[PDB]
Design a protein around this ligand. Structure first.
Ligand SMILES: COc1ccc(C[C@@H]2NC(=O)/C=C/C[C@@H]([C@H](C)[C@H]3O[C@@H]3c3ccccc3)OC(=O)[C@H](CC(C)C)OC(=O)C(C)(C)CNC2=O)cc1Cl
Ligand SMILES: Nc1nc2c(ncn2[C@@H]2O[C@H](COP(=O)(O)OP(=O)(O)OP(=O)(O)O)[C@@H](O)[C@H]2O)c(=O)[nH]1
Ligand SMILES: Nc1nc2c(ncn2[C@@H]2O[C@H](COP(=O)(O)OP(=O)(O)O)[C@@H](O)[C@H]2O)c(=O)[nH]1
Lengths: 425, 428
C-alpha cells in the first residue's frame, strides 16, 4: 500500500487531529498499544496509508504534530492517544505567534521550517513510494496558517509531483474573538490558491450554526466542534482507509473532483450528525444535500455542483441508494452543471463509524463556496480600508502590496467562479 | 523571566513614581527598608513581582526605577523622605531646569545630560535578561517632562527599536497650572513622541481635582495619592496573577489598533470618604463625570474595553452587570468586530494608605477603554495652541535654544492630521 504522511499545524490542527486519530483507531480496531484488536479483515487492509508498522505488531501513526507552544504538546501527551503517537515526531517551538501570520510565515515559521523539513525528509526517504501529504490547520491563527502555508511552499518546492491535501479551517467571527483573522485567512487563501491542489473548506460558522439549530446547543464549545469535524473527516477518509469501487486515493480524488487548478475548494458534509434514531436511505439522501447540514457557510441553491462524491457507510442496499440518488439528481437537475455528465459518484463501505449504525458523507466542489470567499474578503475590506493592526504585519518585512495582491487574487477567483457559474451547456 | 524599567521624568513624574512605588511596597507587603517577610524564603525571582522588583545579593527588593529630573530637590526628597530602598546610582539629578520650555529640555539643557541617562538605562537593562520595555512617567506641561521625555523617546526608539514603550503623561489643567505655555509644550511633545509611544494614559489634574472636591482646594499631595491609586490599580494586573493585560504587548494589542491612536481612557467608581453593588460600580465606570479625562464618550464611539476588577468580586454577577450595561443605548461600538468588556478579576483586595485619602473598599473596578472622545481634548489643546500662535506669542523662548520656527507649524500639521484621523475613525 502507499504511504501518506500526516501533518498537523496549530493547536486547532493538533486538537482536531487527536480527535480524528482517536475516531480512526476506534474504527480500525487499534488499541493504545498499537496492536490490532478488530474483528474484520478489512480494518487491517489499507492500513499502511496512515499507520506505520513498528516492531512487535505496533501500528503507530505517521503524524507530525507541529506547534509553537509546548502546552499543546503536553495536552496531546496527556490524552489517551499520546503514548500511541510517535514521540520522535513531536516538534514544538518556544514562543507562539499569537494570531500573527507574519510572525509564523517570515520569522518563526522560517526558523522552524528547516527542522520540519528535516523531519519530513527523514519520513520521506524511508518511503517505498510517496502518495501525498495531508495537512490539517486553521486559516485564522498565527503559527497555524502561516506555518502551514510555509510548509506547503517548501513541500511544493521539494516534491512537485506529489499531491497536497489541506483541511483548511476558515475562521468565523461567531466563535473567534480575534479581529485580525481576515488578514491571515486572505493571505493563506492566496497562498493555497497558488501552491495547493486540494482544499477541504470546513467553516466554523456553519459548525456553530449546526450546533445551534440541529443539536440545539447554545454554547459553541470546542469539544463538540472537534467531534463533528473528526466525524466528517473520518467519513471523508473512509474512501482512502478502505478498498472499494471508488478508491479515490488522493490523486484519483483530485482527478474526479477538481476541474481547474484554482477552483479546488471542496465542501464536506455529514448527514447523520448527532452530539455526544431511525436511519434509512432516503432521509439520509435528503439530509445529504441540505443547506443546514453542510459544514461550510454556503447556499447550494445559489450555486451549481461541479462534482459530487457521496459516500455511504454501513449495511445498506446499494440498489436503493443508487435509485434514491438518481431520483435526487433528476429532480434537481438545475442544481448540477449540465456540461459535466455523471458528476455524482457513489461508494458504499460496510464498516460504519462507531456510535452510528449508518453514515452519509458528501464531498462537493460547489460554486456556493464563493459566498465564503466573498464574506471573508468583505470582512478583509472593512479591516484594510482603515488599516487596523497593519503595523504588526508590515513591521515584519511584509509589504503592504501583499494584502492588495491577496485581495486581487481572491477577487479574481470570485470573478472566475461567477463566470463559470453563468456558463451553461 | 520578564522585567520592566520604570522611568520618571520631571517633578510630576518623580512624585507620582515615588507615590506609586510606595503603594506597590504597601500592596505586595514589601517592607520600606527593602526586605520581605514572607516571600524572601525562596530568595529568588519570578514570584510574580519580578516584572518590577529586582533582588540584590543581600535580599533587598530594590525596584527597577530610574528617577530623572533637572531639579535635585524632589530627588533629595525621595532620598531623604526610601533612602536604602532606592539606590543613589540610579537616581539621576540635574543642575538647571528647563523652566516650562520644551526646546530647553530638548536641545540645550537635556542634551548635556542625555548620554548619562542613556548609560544608566543600559546599566539597569544589563541586569534584565527578558525585559519587555519601559514605563515613561512624565507631564505634558513642564519643561523637563516634555523636552527630556521627547529626547529620551527618540534615543530609545533609535537604540531599543525591538521594544515597546508605554507613556504616563499628565494632561495640563487650568485649575492647577504653573505656566502659560503648557499648550506649546504639550503639542510639541505630542508631535515628537507620537511615533515613539505605544500606550499613553494621559490623565488631567482637573478630573482628579473634581473627584477630590466632590467625593473626598485639595493640594498636590491628595492628587498624588489618588493618581498613585489610579496607576496602581491600572498596573495591578502586571504585578499579580495572570488573567489578562499582564504584558506590554497585551496592553498594546488589546487597546491600540492604529500606530497613532494610542490614548486610552481610565474610569474609577469606588471613591469614598475615609454598600455598593457590582452593577452600580460598573455603571459608574461609564459616567462621563468620573473619567480620568474631562470629555464626553457618548459623542464618540468605543474601540475596546478592558474591565479590571479588584477585591472579592464574584464573577457570576459581572456578566449580569455587563448585560445591564449593554441594554442601554449609550454605548455605540465600532463596526469591525468590536468584541466587548474583556473582564479579568484579581482576587487580591487593593490596599489603601493607612489614614490617607481613600477608604479601604472590597469592590473595585477600572475601565481601560479606548474611544474617540480624546479628540475633544486634543481640539481644546490645539485651540489654545492656535490662539497663542496667531500673533506668535511666546515664540522667542524656544527659538533661542536652536529650535526652528517651522517646528510649530509642523506640530500644528501633525495635530491637524491626528484630529483628521480621529474624525475618519469616527466616520463610517
Ligand atoms: C478596533 O478595536 C478593537 C476591537 C477589538 C479588539 C480585540 C482584542 N485584540 C485583538 O484581537 C488583536 C489581535 C492582534 C494580535 C497581534 C497582531 C499579535 O501579533 C502580536 C503578537 C502577540 C504576541 C507575540 C508576538 C506578537 O494580538 C493577539 O493576537 C494577542 C496575542 C498576545 C496577547 C499574546 O491576543 C489578543 O488579542 C487577546 C488577548 C487573545 C484578545 N484580544 C482582543 O480580543 C481590539 C481592538 Cl484594537
Ligand atoms: N497631578 C500632579 N501634577 C503635577 C505634579 N507636579 C507637577 N505637576 C504638573 O506639572 C505641570 C507643570 O509643570 P512643572 O511645574 O514645570 O513640573 P514638571 O512637569 O515636572 O516640569 P519640570 O519642573 O521642568 O521638571 C502642572 O500642570 C501640573 O499639572 C504633581 O505632583 N501631581
Ligand atoms: N473548529 C474548531 N476551531 C478551532 C478550535 N480551536 C481553534 N480553532 C480556530 O482556530 C483559530 C485559532 O488558530 P490557532 O490554532 O489557535 O493558532 P495558533 O495559536 O497560532 O496556534 C481560531 O480562529 C478558531 O476559530 C477547535 O477546537 N475547533
Amino acid at each position: 500500500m502507499r504511504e501518506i504522511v500526516h501533518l498537523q499545524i496549530g493547536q486547532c490542527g493538533n486538537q482536531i487531529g487527536a480527535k480524528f486519530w482517536e475516531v480512526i483507531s476506534d474504527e480500525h480496531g487499534i488499541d493504545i498499544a498499537g496492536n490490532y484488536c478488530g474483528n474484520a479483515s478489512l480494518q487491517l487492509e489499507r492500513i499502511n496509508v496512515y499507520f506505520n508498522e513498528a516492531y512487535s505488531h505496533k501500528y503507530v501513526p505517521r503524524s507530525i504534530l507541529v506547534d509553537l507552544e509546548p502546552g499543546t504538546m503536553d495536552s496531546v501527551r496527556s490524552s489517551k492517544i499520546g503514548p500511541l503517537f510517535r514521540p520522535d515526531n513531536f516538534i514544538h517551538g518556544n514562543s507562539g505567534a499569537g494570531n500573527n501570520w507574519a510572525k509564523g510565515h517570515y520569522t518563526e515559521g522560517a526558523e522552524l521550517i528547516e527542522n520540519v523539513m528535516d523531519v519530513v525528509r527523514n519520513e520521506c526517504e524511508s518511503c517505498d513510494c510517496l502518495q501525498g501529504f495531508q495537512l490539517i490547520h486553521s486559516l485564522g491563527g498565527g503559527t497555524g496558517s502561516g506555518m502551514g502555508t510555509l510548509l506547503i511552499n517548501k513541500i511544493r518546492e521539494e516534491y512537485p509531483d506529489r499531491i497536497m491535501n489541506t483541511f483548511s479551517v476558515v475562521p468565523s467571527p461567531k466563535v473567534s474573538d480575534t479581529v485580525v483573522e481576515p488578514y491571515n485567512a486572505i493571505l493563506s487563501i492566496h497562498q493555497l490558491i497558488e501552491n495547493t491542489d486540494e482544499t477541504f473548506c470546513i467553516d466554523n460558522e456553519a459548525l456553530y450554526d449546526i450546533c445551534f439549530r440541529t443539536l440545539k446547543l447554545t454554547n459553541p464549545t470546542y469539544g463538540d466542534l472537534n467531534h463533528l469535524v473528526s466525524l466528517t473527516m473520518s467519513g471523508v477518509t473512509t474512501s482512502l482507509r478502505f478498498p472499494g469501487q471508488l478508491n479515490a486515493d488522493l490523486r484519483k480524488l483530485a482527478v474526479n473532483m477538481v476541474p481547474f487548478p484554482r477552483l479546488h475548494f471542496f465542501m464536506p458534509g455529514f448527514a447523520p450528525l448527532t452530539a455526544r434514531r431511525a436511519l434509512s436511505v432516503p432521509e439520509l439522501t435528503q439530509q445529504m444535500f441540505d443547506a443546514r447540514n453542510m459544514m461550510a457557510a454556503c447556499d447550494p441553491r445559489r450555486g451549481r455542483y461541479l462534482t459530487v462524491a457521496c459516500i455511504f457507510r454501513g449495511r445498506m442496499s446499494t440498489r436503493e441508494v443508487d435509485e434514491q440518488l438518481l431520483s435526487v439528481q433528476t429532480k434537481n437537475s438545475s442544481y448540477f452543471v449540465e456540461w459535466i455528465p455523471n458528476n455524482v459518484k457513489v461508494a458504499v463501505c460496510d464498516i460504519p463509524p462507531r456510535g452510528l449504525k449508518m453514515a452519509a458523507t458528501f464531498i462537493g466542489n460547489n460554486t456556493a463556496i464563493q459566498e465564503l470567499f466573498i464574506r471573508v474578503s468583505e470582512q478583509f475590506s472593512a479591516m484594510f480600508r482603515r488599516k487596523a493592526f497593519l503595523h504588526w504585519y508590515t513591521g515584519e518585512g511584509m509589504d503592504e502590496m501583499e494584502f492588495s495582491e491577496a485581495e486581487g487574487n481572491t477577487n479574481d477567483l470570485v470573478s472566475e467562479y461567477q463566470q463559470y457559474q453563468d456558463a451553461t451547456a | 523571566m520578564r522585567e520592566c524599567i520604570s522611568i520618571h521624568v520631571g517633578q510630576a513624574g518623580v512624585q507620582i513614581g515615588n507615590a506609586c512605588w510606595e503603594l506597590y511596597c504597601l500592596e505586595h507587603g514589601i517592607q520600606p527598608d527593602g526586605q520581605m517577610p514572607s516571600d524572601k524564603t525562596i530568595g529568588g525571582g519570578d514570584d510574580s513581582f519580578n516584572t518590577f522588583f529586582s533582588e540584590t545579593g543581600a535580599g533587598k527588593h530594590v525596584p527597577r526605577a530610574v528617577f530623572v529630573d533637572l531639579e535635585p530637590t524632589v530627588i533629595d526628597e525621595v532620598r531623604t523622605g526610601y533612602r536604602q530602598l532606592f539606590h543613589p546610582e540610579q537616581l539621576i539629578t540635574g543642575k538647571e531646569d528647563a523652566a516650562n520650555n520644551y526646546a530647553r529640555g530638548h536641545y540645550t539643557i537635556g542634551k548635556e545630560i542625555i548620554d548619562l541617562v542613556l548609560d544608566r538605562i543600559r546599566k539597569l537593562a544589563d541586569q534584565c535578561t527578558g525585559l519587555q520595555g519601559f514605563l515613561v512617567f512624565h507631564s505634558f506641561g513642564g519643561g523637563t517632562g516634555s523636552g527630556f521625555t521627547s529626547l529620551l523617546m527618540e534615543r530609545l526608539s533609535v537604540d531599543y527599536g525591538k521594544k515597546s514603550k508605554l507613556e504616563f503623561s499628565i494632561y495640563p489643567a487650568p485649575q492647577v497650572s504653573t505656566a502659560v505655555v503648557e499648550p506649546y509644550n504639550s503639542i510639541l511633545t505630542t508631535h515628537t513622541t507620537l511615533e515613539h509611544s505605544d500606550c499613553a494614559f494621559m490623565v488631567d489634574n482637573e478630573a482628579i481635582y473634581d473627584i477630590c472636591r466632590r467625593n473626598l482646594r485639595p493640594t498636590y499631595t491628595n492628587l498624588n495619592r489618588l493618581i498613585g491609586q489610579i496607576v496602581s490599580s491600572i498596573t495591578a494586573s502586571l504585578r499579580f496573577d495572570g488573567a489578562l493585560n499582564v504584558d506590554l504587548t497585551e496592553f498594546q494589542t488589546n487597546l491600540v489598533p492604529y500606530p497613532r491612536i494610542h490614548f486610552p481612557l481610565a474610569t474609577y467608581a469606588p471613591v469614598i470618604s475615609a454598600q455598593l453593588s457590582v452593577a452600580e460600580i460598573t455603571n459608574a465606570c461609564f459616567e462621563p463625570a468620573n473619567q480620568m479625562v474631562k470629555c464626553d464618550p457618548r459623542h464618540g464611539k468605543y474601540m475596546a474595553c478592558c474591565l479590571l476588577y479588584r477585591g472579592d468580586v464574584v464573577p457570576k454577577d459581572v456578566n449580569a452587570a455587563i448585560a445591564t450595561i449593554k441594554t442601554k443605548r449609550t454605548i455605540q461600538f465600532v463596526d469591525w468586530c468590536p468584541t466587548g468588556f474583556k473582564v479579568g478579576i484579581n482576587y487580591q483586595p487593593p490596599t489603601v494608605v493607612p489614614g490617607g485619602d481613600l477608604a479601604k473598599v472590597q469592590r473595585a473596578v477600572c475601565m481601560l477603554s479606548n474611544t474617540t472622545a480624546i479628540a475633544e481634548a486634543w481640539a481644546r489643546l490645539d485651540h489654545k495652541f492656535d490662539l497663542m500662535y496667531a500673533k506668535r506669542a511666546f515664540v522667542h523662548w524656544y527659538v533661542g535654544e536652536g529650535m526652528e520656527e517651522g517646528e510649530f507649524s509642523e506640530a500644528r500639521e501633525d495635530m491637524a492630521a491626528l484630529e483628521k484621523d480621529y474624525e475618519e475613525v469616527g466616520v463610517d
